[PDB]
Symmetry: C3
Subunit: 405 residues, 3 copies
């Protein structure tokens, strides 16, 4: 499996890259990308039962602390891993270069989605209004919430005086587990397609946007991937070791999701695999159940590091000192944008504006707008990497709060 | 419990009221309404499983009569309680006078709701086309219907020749009961937040519309509340007592629903609590499972009483003789719009036009428009009261048909 | 039933027919059609749970072959039965004649549906993106797919070394079967309404379009019906008989679905009755569970026949030679459109264009557009017949792939 995917990944990225230089970009998109979609598709499909079932059951564990404790632990873990990652980006963007060379074609045309939901209508939006609707619409947040409340609820019912009560409660709680179980059985079968999918998936990415990783972009591309590489070593290997956990047992188990998350670019779409991985490394369904999903949307260290290295790239190709010292605002805003950024195909660059405006350079004065347009050119490239470091870091922390609680 | 809420209630009312007389209305809203929202959120959530689950189970009771009997009983009980209520509000509107004080500013703007669905595509719309969708979209009517057809079906399945058919039936039927059971477990938990919720809720209501209970409205305001008051004494207590049931054990057990319905204003959103109260006083799940939901949308004695007093208020501020003798039309159309009115936040005043134009005064002729416009200024206040009489009345007739059948 | 359904259909088709010849069409439509709608509503209701549940369960049978084998078989079966039907239409439309009587009214108006989703965005669209969304949205295909994958997934879970895995698996698998079981109990119940519905339903159709089946249209009408009849004897009996299964016993056991489908016109909405008929003749729930739905959208021998007799009707009123020899284009295109045509109210006529344009005469050349607009007059008439030969042949194919595999 891991060799058939790697065989696919490598020979793919190569087969792609050739065609992009021979001008077959469009022809890879009309013939190859679908085979790679059937994969992204066949994954998205498991996201909803798997997440749901494996968390109502996931209130197996001790309500008050376990969950509550595990939560407070991984939330603090998430925030720090995020904040650090942008700092490591901020620096990486100094060492390796963004780009001082002047951006040509002024006026790229970048729209203003200022109608950005008020923070209150987001936090309040975390409580479902129809667990069923929320359930049948994606919405892997309220769905998380309702699962927990339903789980905790089921647990209490089993400690009841009545024999009736605890019986029907265990019928349901079992049935829900049937699903939970049945779902992984699938994540496995539909993982076998991953080779073809992976190959076909990058065949597009490279033959469409790789054939442009040159100029100052090449510097940035590299300025990001190196920044990324370090985030794994300097942060995940470093925090794993001190936490009594084997870095090679880690990055060999999670070697499955690690890749899916890189070819798909959908952190959220990778969730079924990410969750099989956590399960297939013996973590309690009370941890990986409320950590990976809550994290498949909060912890985006990779995106944050990317947001840092990108604030400088526009600050350079614009001509500011990046408000030296007050680039701790970037450190902050990029942590705030991390949370927000949604784990869909490629919306980190979109949610990158909030940070850009915080350093002082809005997406409207067409110098900033036309420089941004260049970043968006090398984005299928940039994302892959960060959308790994995004899923990896969520496991790193599941593995921590694993041993811990 | 009832005290923690009562403390919050009275104290909130005062806190609000004062802030509204100092000009802090927009600050309560931006700050305090969300705590009251989180409450309504947390309830709206349980509305869908609770209704579904506790009704498939609800087909424990004897298919033919019980349901078929209890049904026809509670509809007659409902229609009359609604008719009585508007008559009682017409009386209450002649005695306590609405207001012959000539309408002020001419320019209210009220578009015509003529596109009010045909009765055909309303009755037929009671049969769901996708129980799963009807299930996952609110729609607590077709959902009611399916639940019963599912139950009754699960009932026949147990009396089967095969032991497998009867086994699986009892699996499902049980699992379903898990949810239902589990869902009340939450009604009790989420009930604990209510004090903070309640306080936060009226805090807004009063410091936004309470600080406007003046002019002719103050009369109408009171003209309505005194009517509502009687509707509890003269009808509910009187019809409770006569059927061999204790009015004080009633208002003692149903104290919870009554209040949540008063602050929420959501008759429908109060359904979980209301349904716990029904079970928390021993009505069989074969009755409160099909009376309260079907009642949270048909029986709205309060709205009809509020719809009575309000047709006159415009007949007074317009100079119409309230079409003496032919005000039996209000009596009818209000019983007809009662039904129609949906237990959402505040649509009694909207569904009022059906009754208004039936009396002769159309919502288009600027005089009526500008009359209506004032009533709608003091609505949060006006609604709270009738929202109570609305939930209350559903319990009353469920308590009647409790003893009867 | 059987005779009350027949008594309703016969007297109804007449009661209708009469009112039309006197001018009351619209009245039949305001008072009668609703009863015949409450039937179609009461069927459509069970198409979603009956389909899903009777197929997760339907992964009773041997994963590898059985399914796969059964699958490859029915598809070849369908593709041949379809292709034959049209050929049988072409012929039937050469012997019986469309019309050499020149189209009159030029000025009918037909908007070009050039936006016809690509075959790729249809085939990838067969895999759900949220089984729950697709569950709650019709989508009796994505849902078919996810069922099989959750069924097969559950089977393996049952042969698990753990006892926990195999317990919760059989709890779930049972709960699902409960519904599947319950859902047939209903199809029986709401099948009793059938005579009322049937009666009311042809009452409309006849008294609104029957009183128009005259002239070259009456010829066409007969040409399509004589053609359909022949598709039944010459292909269904003659293909049942050869495969060793009694025709009279087949067209006796499926006289139920056979009729609902003729009065409903919705092959898709008839499904629950079609599935009960399958079960009630003893086909394994692992065949009729994945042959009938994946047939209520792909196998439409009826539509296809009607598509050949129509492509001929136009090239006659228009005066072409129907591209003689190359009407095997139609033969092909029709089978291709048959698949596409989806078993809803009356859209075979809509999807007819693709065949027409392939033959040569597009729907926008105001001549063709006016011939076609006549065909669309006697449509629910033509539809009834082909919406039978449509379902009938979806069983015939399950009756073969029953015996064989």
């Amino acid at each position: 499996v891991l060799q058939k995917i790697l065989i696919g990944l490598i020979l793919g990225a190569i087969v792609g890259l050739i065609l992009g230089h021979y001008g077959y970009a469009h022809a890879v998109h009309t013939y190859v990308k679908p085979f790679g979609d059937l994969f992204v598709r066949l994954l998205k499909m498991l996201v909803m039962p798997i997440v749901f079932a494996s968390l109502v059951v996931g209130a197996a564990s001790i309500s008050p602390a376990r969950l509550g404790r595990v939560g407070v632990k991984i939330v603090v873990y998430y925030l720090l891993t995020s904040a650090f990652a942008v700092t490591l980006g901020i620096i990486m963007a100094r060492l390796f270069n963004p780009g001082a060379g002047i951006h040509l074609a002024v006026g790229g045309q970048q729209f203003q989605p200022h109608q950005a939901p008020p923070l209150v209508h987001i936090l309040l939006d975390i409580v479902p209004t129809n667990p069923f609707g929320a359930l049948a619409n994606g919405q892997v947040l309220p769905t998380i919430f309702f699962a927990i409340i339903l789980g905790i609820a089921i647990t209490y019912l089993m400690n009841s005086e009545n024999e009736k009560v605890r019986k029907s409660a265990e019928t349901l709680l079992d049935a829900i587990n049937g699903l939970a179980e049945a779902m992984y059985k699938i994540v496995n079968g539909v993982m076998q397609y991953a080779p073809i999918g992976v190959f076909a998936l990058i065949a597009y990415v490279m033959a469409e946007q790789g054939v442009h990783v040159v100029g100052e972009l090449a510097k940035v591309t590299a300025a990001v991937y190196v920044g990324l590489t370090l985030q794994i070593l300097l942060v995940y290997f470093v925090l794993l070791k001190i936490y009594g956990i084997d870095p090679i047992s880690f990055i060999k188990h999670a070697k499955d999701a690690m890749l899916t998350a890189f070819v798909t670019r959908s952190s959220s779409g990778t969730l079924p695999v990410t969750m099989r991985v956590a399960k297939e490394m013996g973590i309690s369904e009370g941890i990986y159940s409320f950590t990976l999903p809550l994290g498949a949307t909060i912890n985006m260290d990779g995106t944050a590091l990317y947001q840092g290295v990108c604030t400088f790239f526009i600050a350079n190709a614009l001509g500011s000192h990046l408000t030296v010292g007050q680039q701790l605002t970037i450190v902050l805003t990029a942590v705030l944008a991390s949370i927000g950024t949604a784990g869909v195909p490629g919306a980190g660059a979109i949610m990158l504006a909030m940070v850009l405006h915080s350093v002082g350079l809005p997406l409207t004065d067409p110098n900033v707008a036309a420089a941004y347009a260049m970043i968006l050119g090398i984005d299928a490239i940039l994302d892959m990497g960060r959308t790994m470091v995004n899923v990896t870091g969520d496991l790193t922390g599941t593995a921590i709060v694993a041993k811990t609680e």
